[PDB]
Design a protein around this nucleic acid. Structure first.
Ligand code: MG
Ligand code: MG
Ligand code: MG
Ligand code: MG
Ligand code: MG
Ligand code: MG
Ligand code: MG
Length: 45
RNA sequence: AGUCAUAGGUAGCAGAACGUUCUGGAACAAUUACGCUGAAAACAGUAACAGAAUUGAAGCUGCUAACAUAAGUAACACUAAAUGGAUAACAUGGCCGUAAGCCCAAGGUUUUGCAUAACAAACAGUGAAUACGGUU
């Protein structure tokens, strides 16, 4: 559900102009973001 | 056309001229000029006669613009410290660590991402779905 080289900071991400997401934008800056996946109840980091 | 007389000058006064732009007299540079000199000067070598002037500039610590001088001079000394053939990913060393870390506010308003030069800004990027802040 996460791309951990991007999370630790050692890979480029989807939307690479962000570089420091808030609580939301973690879901959409993930390189492994699947649109067909359901959306979680709280949308955490 | 031969004799005589006069000719230092500030302030000031008087007389004679040169030059710039424009106009009148129908039109004086379509096809340029260029023998390099002439004149006492202002100057002349693309009319002349009159007229109208925002009419003459080394000289106002004048204004504007350009270009020099000082001069390749001063400066590139607040800080932690760098090394390996790279402002390196790797390795070694060091500095902060109530900050030189992290999260926001005010303010800024695209300053944010992409190419081992390149033709790349012309292209991208900010998602309210936890009773996030506002609007009340
Ligand atoms: Mg005299
Ligand atoms: Mg005398
Ligand atoms: Mg005439
Ligand atoms: Mg005048
Ligand atoms: Mg030098
Ligand atoms: Mg180095
Ligand atoms: Mg702001």
């Amino acid at each position: 559900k996460w791309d951990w080289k991007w999370v630790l900071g050692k890979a480029s991400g989807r939307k690479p102009a962000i570089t420091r997401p808030r609580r939301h934008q973690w879901h959409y800056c993930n390189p492994e973001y699947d649109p067909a996946a359901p959306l979680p109840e709280v949308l955490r980091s």
